[PDB]
């Protein structure tokens, strides 16, 4: 098996405040095939400059997807008072062909922080935490989002210095605010920037310890840590489940600026994943310390044939989704990105 280190000795889990309505915002970001948003490069081989049609799991063009945002906890000027999270834990999302995440989209811009409408801070890139399980169950209190045995959990750590992925059984602690405990809230991760994000004070398992209080790790199959540089530049994360194993794709590892997705890690899980839930994250910081954070976008993938344009570097600058519309279908028929205007076959 694997060792996650000593379990948290905290008597009770920290109280969580759920404000889904405050978190909800109008932020539409449709997938743009033209800019090759969320498309994985063919893993088999590099391709020639001439445009080549390729068939793979791909997000629908023009699909906004699901938007999730992480915001700082309610805080008095002297100290933080309570965690602030949405109702993401209750929400359960079906996993079929896997999903692609948009990270750092709102970074490098200034927008009001979710916790205070009056307060405005520069938005900074933040990294989402995802829990994927073969099966899901109701919570002891009857809330949705409880996860069964052998559920994979991925959490970024050290303000995004490293990413930790582990597939382990989850056991709720009996402490209050934990799922087994009275007044149970929701599974969540909490970090303090001064305690860990300050240089030389980084804690390798700080995110794991906060998750451990809500759910203990029992008989974990394996624990894997991958170190990813933290950058404001937009990056894409892709996760899919195959019989050979789970595949992890990071844009930052190969083409951070391009946004093209290339597999960086292989996870040996042969169990099919049918359900995934986003894990809400709360930042424990004072009101001055609290800053706006980027909102992650999740897009489901479905098998489709996409015209692919390859640069001399070979990166896919642009793509065409034939299924999206009749105009794209005529481009797909000719297998050419640009075609002379003509009458074309239609449904």
């Amino acid at each position: 098996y694997v060792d996650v280190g000593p379990d948290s000795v905290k008597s009770a889990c920290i109280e969580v405040d759920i404000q889904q309505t405050f978190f909800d915002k109008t932020w539409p970001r449709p997938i743009d095939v033209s800019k090759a948003d969320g498309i994985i490069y063919p893993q088999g081989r590099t391709y020639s400059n001439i445009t080549i049609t390729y068939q793979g799991l791909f997000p629908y063009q023009g699909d906004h997807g699901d938007m999730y945002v992480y915001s700082a906890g309610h805080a008095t000027g002297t100290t933080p008072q309570k965690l602030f999270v949405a109702n993401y834990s209750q929400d359960v999302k079906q996993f079929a062909n896997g999903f692609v995440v948009r990270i750092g989209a709102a970074a490098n811009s200034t927008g009001t922080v979710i916790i205070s409408p009056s307060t405005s801070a520069t938005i900074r890139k933040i990294y989402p935490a995802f829990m994927l399980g073969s099966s899901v169950g109701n919570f002891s209190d009857g809330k949705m989002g409880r996860f069964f045995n052998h559920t994979l959990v991925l959490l970024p750590d050290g303000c995004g210095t490293l990413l930790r992925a582990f597939y382990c059984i989850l056991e709720p602690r009996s402490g209050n605010h934990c799922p087994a405990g009275n007044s149970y809230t929701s599974f969540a991760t909490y970090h303090t920037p001064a305690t860990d994000c300050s240089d030389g004070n980084y804690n390798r398992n700080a995110s794991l310890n906060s998750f451990k209080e809500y759910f203990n790790l029992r008989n974990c199959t394996f624990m894997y840590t991958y170190n990813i540089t933290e950058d404001e530049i937009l990056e894409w994360f892709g996760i899919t489940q195959t019989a050979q194993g789970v595949h992890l794709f990071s844009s930052r590892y190969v083409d951070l600026y391009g946004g093209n997705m290339f597999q960086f890690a292989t996870l040996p899980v042969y169990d099919t994943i049918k359900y995934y839930s986003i894990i809400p994250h709360s930042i424990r910081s004072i009101q001055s310390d609290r800053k706006a954070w980027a909102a992650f976008y999740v897009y489901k993938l479905q098998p489709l044939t996409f015209l692919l344009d390859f640069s001399v570097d070979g990166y896919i600058r642009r793509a065409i989704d034939c299924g999206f519309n009749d105009l794209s279908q005529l481009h797909c028929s000719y297998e050419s990105f640009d075609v002379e205007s003509g009458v074309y076959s239609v449904s």
Epitope: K10, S11, A12, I14, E15, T78, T79, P80, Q81, K82, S140, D141, G142, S174, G175, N176, H177, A180, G181, N182, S183, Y184, T192, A194, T195, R284
Partner: antibody
């Protein structure tokens, strides 16, 4: 706003089954119910504790003699007493207990407790 | 289990006097200890929860400090109404059983 009352306490023969506590105008579903027993010549102790879910029940000086079942829709918690003895017989109080929340890094403290409306108690007596 | 005995079963104290009440557990299983003040016809009240921060709704006159296994409560400006039986409970999340205070009755010394 919390309302707590205990019912079904009565004089009983030894080795008898006696049905408890009721709650009104309160969020009983998310709050665990704790039963405490006081008898003359001995200090207050918690005879039985049940979680808000009610899946797990803890009994504390008896071999699980007390049986506790709570219905949140009913808003009433049912306690069963069996093999009752004169020394065992005592007034029983039902109250909801919530542990205080604390922040380790800043030392910040949140009371997070609902000890209000502690049960008045019901007296059960064994006599011959 | 835990064996707890309060050092005085009953304490006689004059009005407006400074006195210490000590309850000693077999061992201090947890930092949190719930002191309880009981008045006949009145529901039990938690004087202190962890012995480091006073419980809300409790007067500053009762202060609980624990040295070693023994836990000591310090009271000043005693009053006839203030006098009440004192119970101390050691609370441990792992242990289902909850400690019961022996009880100390307070009467005037004169």
């Amino acid at each position: 706003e919390v309302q707590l009352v205990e019912s079904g306490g009565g004089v009983v023969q030894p080795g008898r089954s006696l049905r408890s506590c009721a709650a009104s105008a309160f969020t009983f579903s998310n709050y665990g119910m704790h039963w405490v027993r006081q008898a003359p010549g001995k200090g207050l102790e918690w005879v039985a504790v049940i979680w808000s879910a009610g899946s797990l029940k803890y009994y504390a000086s008896v071999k699980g003699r007390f049986i506790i079942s709570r219905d949140n829709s009913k808003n009433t918690l049912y306690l069963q007493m069996d093999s009752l003895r004169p020394e065992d017989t005592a007034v029983y109080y039902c109250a909801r207990e919530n542990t205080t929340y604390y922040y380790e890094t800043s030392g910040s403290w949140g009371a997070s407790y609902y000890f209000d409306f502690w049960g008045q108690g019901t007296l059960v007596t064994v006599s011959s | 289990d835990i064996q707890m005995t309060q050092t005085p079963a009953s304490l006689s104290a004059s009005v407006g006097d400074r006195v210490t009440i000590t309850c000693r557990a077999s061992q201090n299983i947890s930092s949190y200890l719930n002191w309880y003040q009981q008045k006949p016809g009145k529901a039990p009240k938690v004087l202190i929860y962890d012995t480091s921060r006073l419980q809300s709704g409790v007067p500053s006159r009762f202060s609980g400090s624990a040295s070693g296994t023994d836990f000591t409560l310090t009271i000043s400006s005693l009053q006839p109404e203030d006098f009440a039986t004192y119970y101390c409970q050691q609370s441990c999340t792992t242990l289902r059983c909850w400690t019961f205070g022996q009880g100390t009755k307070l009467e005037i010394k004169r």
